Design a protein around this ligand. Sequence first.
Ligand SMILES: [Ca+2]
Ligand SMILES: [Zn+2]
Length: 314
Amino acid sequence: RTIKVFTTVDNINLHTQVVDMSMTYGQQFGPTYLDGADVTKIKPHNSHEGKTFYVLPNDDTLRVEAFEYYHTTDPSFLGRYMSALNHTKKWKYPQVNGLTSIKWADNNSYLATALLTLQQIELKFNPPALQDAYYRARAGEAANFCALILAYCNKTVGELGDVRETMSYLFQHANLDSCKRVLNVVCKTCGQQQTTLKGVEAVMYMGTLSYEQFKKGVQIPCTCGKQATKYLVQQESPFVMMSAPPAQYELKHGTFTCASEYTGNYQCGHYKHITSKETLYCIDGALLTKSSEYKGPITDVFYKENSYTTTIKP
Ligand SMILES: [Ca+2]
Ligand SMILES: [Zn+2]
């Protein structure tokens, strides 16, 4: 028996195939997937006629196609992305206040808060798989985007996650080289140290939530033994992510783009997303509340930026 099916590694370039129906998909193709479901232990059915299957890049041509779409060499990427897709395709992606969210499942609260932020900051991905699925996620079809995020972060479904850490991985696949940050560490004895950062390191900071206070200056204990002052000199970026360990923080309307709230501790933590619109909106998975004032345990705050110049003399 024979049916005709298609094989692909990017869902773009399809390949016509003849399949012996007395064998399994793994026997003729190797590890094979149909929209996430592993069908390696499965033999062709008549219902599969004309359907498209993911495989692993066995030949070079599939490897050439796979690198262009995903920008990775990691041959495990397809199985991990397919394994993630098999779950994320079943998640619910409601529109909450005009943004694509995720109904909570499999400890995806950090994914929901990240996805919500990605929709409110200016950003473009370099791998086509990411940018294609990023576009579809903004349209409401976020299953493939979320599965790709897990594959690029080497995370699995159900595993707990950090939003700041998740952005870190994704910023490596965006085009942020144009971003530039300059910092002056002024230490009363060590001196006035300057650093220039390019790329992902130029938009992220771990220490405080306030961007104006980051412009004014923050003390950091120096490697000598005393205290040292830390402030921003030049910021050239579309946005800035300011992170701090979860602590009670007052979110003031119109002073930020969006923020990450983290309540709980250890294995009992949970993320909520706060965004600034005409008033303050709290998106918690598929749930939505609104208020004029907000105070909570914030761990990330995003701000808009273009070009900043400090008023501090070197
Ligand atoms: Ca929308
Ligand atoms: Zn010092």
